[PDB]
Amino acid sequence: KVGIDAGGTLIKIVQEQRTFKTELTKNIDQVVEWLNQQQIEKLCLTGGNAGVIAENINIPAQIFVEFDAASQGLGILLKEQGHDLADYIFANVGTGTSLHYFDGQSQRRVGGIGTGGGMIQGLGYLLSQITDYKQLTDMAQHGDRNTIDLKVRHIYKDTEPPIPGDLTAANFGHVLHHLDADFTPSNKLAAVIGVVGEVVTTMAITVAREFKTENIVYIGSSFHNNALLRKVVEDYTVLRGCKPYYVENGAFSGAIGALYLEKHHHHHH
Amino acid sequence: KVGIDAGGTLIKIVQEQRTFKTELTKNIDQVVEWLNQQQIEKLCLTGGNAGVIAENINIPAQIFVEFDAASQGLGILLKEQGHDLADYIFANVGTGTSLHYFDGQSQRRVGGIGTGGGMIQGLGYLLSQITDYKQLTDMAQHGDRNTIDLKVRHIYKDTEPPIPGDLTAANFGHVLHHLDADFTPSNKLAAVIGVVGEVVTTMAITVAREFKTENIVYIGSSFHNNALLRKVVEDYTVLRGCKPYYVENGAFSGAIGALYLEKHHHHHH
Numbered sequence: 001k002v003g004i005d006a007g008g009t010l011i012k013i014v015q016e017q018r019t020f021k022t023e024l025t026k027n028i029d030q031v032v033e034w035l036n037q038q039q040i041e042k043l044c045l046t047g048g049n050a051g052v053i054a055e056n057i058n059i060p061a062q063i064f065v066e067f068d069a070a071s072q073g074l075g076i077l078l079k080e081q082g083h084d085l086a087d088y089i090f091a092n093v094g095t096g097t098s099l100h101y102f103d104g105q106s107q108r109r110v111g112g113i114g115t116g117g118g119m120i121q122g123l124g125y126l127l128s129q130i131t132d133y134k135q136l137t138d139m140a141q142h143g144d145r146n147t148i149d150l151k152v153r154h155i156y157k158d159t160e161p162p163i164p165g166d167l168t169a170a171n172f173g174h175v176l177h178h179l180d181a182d183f184t185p186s187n188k189l190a191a192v193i194g195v196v197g198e199v200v201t202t203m204a205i206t207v208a209r210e211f212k213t214e215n216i217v218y219i220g221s222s223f224h225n226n227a228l229l230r231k232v233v234e235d236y237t238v239l240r241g242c243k244p245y246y247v248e249n250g251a252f253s254g255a256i257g258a259l260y261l262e263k264h265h266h267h268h269h
Numbered sequence: 270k271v272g273i274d275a276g277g278t279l280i281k282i283v284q285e286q287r288t289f290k291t292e293l294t295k296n297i298d299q300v301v302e303w304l305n306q307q308q309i310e311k312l313c314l315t316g317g318n319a320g321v322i323a324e325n326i327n328i329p330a331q332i333f334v335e336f337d338a339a340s341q342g343l344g345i346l347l348k349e350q351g352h353d354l355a356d357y358i359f360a361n362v363g364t365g366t367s368l369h370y371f372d373g374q375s376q377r378r379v380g381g382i383g384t385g386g387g388m389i390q391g392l393g394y395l396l397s398q399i400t401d402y403k404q405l406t407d408m409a410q411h412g413d414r415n416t417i418d419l420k421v422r423h424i425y426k427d428t429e430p431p432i433p434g435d436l437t438a439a440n441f442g443h444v445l446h447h448l449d450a451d452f453t454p455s456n457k458l459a460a461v462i463g464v465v466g467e468v469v470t471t472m473a474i475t476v477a478r479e480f481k482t483e484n485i486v487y488i489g490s491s492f493h494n495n496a497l498l499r500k501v502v503e504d505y506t507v508l509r510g511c512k513p514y515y516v517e518n519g520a521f522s523g524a525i526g527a528l529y530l531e532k533h534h535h536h537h538h
């Protein structure tokens with residue numbers, strides 16, 4: 001069997017040892033072409049575009065809701081990778097961002113936000129005219145956010161501030177103080193990644209506090225080829241007294257979960 | 270006496286009936302010029318740039334921390350305007366955004382984020398080259414976000430989604446699906462206001478849930494001349510089962526609070 005998580009931007013495919021593959025959601029027809037060349041008895045599907053695959057191929061399919069599939073696959077990966085966490089927030093930073101509290105037994109969605117990988121690509125395109133994901137993310141890595149973002153220390157100056165001075169006070173809030181600066185593509189893109197990372201993290205640490213867990217597990221393809229994003233998120237998570245976890249193949253959590261859920265759907269009473 | 274909240278972008282001045290005035294923080298020297306033409310016995314100061322005013326003029330001054338000054342002024346304005354709220358979140362959407370829980374007696378800061386008025390101006394400048402605040406905000410009001418923002422309904426298509434289809438899934442996440450669109454200045458600016466409003470609101474409703482209040486009071490100068498921002502925030506607050514409140518002269522809460530705190534600082538035992 002095959003597990004497929006057909007998301008808003010990427011289609012994640014898991015073949016069973018696991019073989020991992022991705023395809024762009026825009027190229028969903030090419031996934032169907034690939035499937036038609038395999039010897040597959042059943043599709044285990046999840047994600048927003050699961051229905052599009054199912055209706056376009058004659059292989060029997062079963063669909064699972066992404067939140068439960070992602071939680072189940074993530075729980076499997078965490079254990080494989082040596083983590084025995086009692087509870088955690090997980091933040092699925094996909095095309096958009098979905099936040100979940102896992103209490104040790106099951107997941108509940110506790111929030112979400114439109115700041116995620118889609119914004120990185122879209123706002124990154126508006127600021128740089130780069131459409132290629134590897135080019136965009138590579139360009140951002142070494143950007144300097146200092147002429148773009150305002151820190152608390154910039155507002156309070158010689159007065160000791162009421163919250164730590166190094167914190168971002170206003171994303172893009174320094175632009176009007178640097179109107180003669182060279183706002184390079186790298187610098188602008190670093191600031192896009194900065195705001196996305198800071199928003200995701202802020203929401204994750206807030207729901208971590210609300211649900212009384214110190215653990216925050218970050219998954220999603222948005223971290224791929226984006227070490228800057230991983231650092232923005234890791235650093236701020238630690239600053240706010242929580243423990244960040246990244247997961248090898250975590251972006252395939254849903255696909256793994258779909259396979260697992262299909263397998264255990266069979267029972268009787 | 271005079272109350273002055275010298276913030277990151279605007280200096281809010283209250284003279285006592287109240288007279289309200291603003292000046293750009295960049296023009297802080299002109300506030301000092303104005304002060305030197307008045308007959309003022311004492312300055313009641315708050316905000317990040319309070320120290321700059323105090324060190325540049327010979328009028329006796331007392332400084333108050335903005336969070337307590339804002340809370341106190343807001344509590345005064347709410348009562349003046351007929352609201353007797355038992356508790357509430359207040360979201361101070363200034364150059365950046367600071368979030369507070371007021372339990373009926375005092376405030377505590379419960380979060381914050383760099384998505385606020387500074388981002389509107391800075392990212393708005395990067396996308397439109399407009400520096401004038403009235404021009405920028407006026408241009409945004411009637412922008413169409415539909416080719417820029419991705420909704421849940423766009424990902425899930427003919428499948429009923431696990432969360433409501435009209436929700437923003439990814440700010441700027443539709444850009445790559447509309448690469449031949451005319452991304453007009455109005456449309457781009459509406460999307461900037463959209464992401465700021467949605468992030469602020471998301472954080473406000475999350476801490477409202479955490480601290481068990483249905484009331485969210487929004488203050489800050491970021492709402493001035495920005496009906497779109499007010500609508501984005503109001504609508505999403507209501508959708509998430511909370512009650513939004515806007516306050517006449519709410520952006521002057523800190524200045525009013527500074528005057529009040531100075532007046533009642535005098536006591537003995």
Ligand SMILES: Nc1ncnc2c1ncn2[C@@H]1O[C@H](COP(=O)(O)OP(=O)(O)O)[C@@H](O)[C@H]1O
Nearest residue numbers: 007008009010094095117118133220221222224
């Ligand atoms: N090869 C790639 N092409 C396009 N986007 C990519 C790629 N690798 C990583 N990404 C990033 O990952 C995001 C998608 O994350 P993912 O978790 O797969 O979301 P979804 O389930 O919505 O498809 C993209 O918006 C982009 O930021």
Ligand SMILES: Nc1ncnc2c1ncn2[C@@H]1O[C@H](COP(=O)(O)OP(=O)(O)O)[C@@H](O)[C@H]1O
Nearest residue numbers: 276277278279363364386387402489490491493
């Ligand atoms: N006349 C104006 N000039 C510049 N910005 C304005 C003006 N009116 C409203 N704003 C908006 O209000 C924001 C500042 O809000 P405010 O609550 O005064 O913050 P601060 O206390 O940091 O100065 C600006 O970033 C901008 O979005």
Ligand SMILES: COCCCCCNC(=O)CCNC(=O)[C@H](O)C(C)(C)COP(=O)(O)O
Nearest residue numbers: 007008094095096097098112113436437438
């Ligand atoms: C009108 O909209 C007001 C603001 C809504 C803000 C909150 N938005 C959300 O919670 C949706 C965020 N996005 C997500 O949760 C995900 O992108 C999903 C829609 C679940 C789709 O999953 P994926 O394709 O993996 O990103």
Ligand SMILES: COCCCCCNC(=O)CCNC(=O)[C@H](O)C(C)(C)COP(=O)(O)O
Nearest residue numbers: 167168169276277363364365366367381382
């Ligand atoms: C390194 O930074 C990591 C991310 C930090 C994100 C959180 N940032 C914050 O909480 C600061 C948000 N901004 C604010 O609270 C306000 O702008 C203040 C700094 C209090 C200044 O007040 P004002 O001038 O009125 O906006």
Ligand SMILES: [Mg+2]
Nearest residue numbers: 007008047094
């Ligand atoms: Mg996904």
Ligand SMILES: [Mg+2]
Nearest residue numbers: 276277316363
């Ligand atoms: Mg302020």
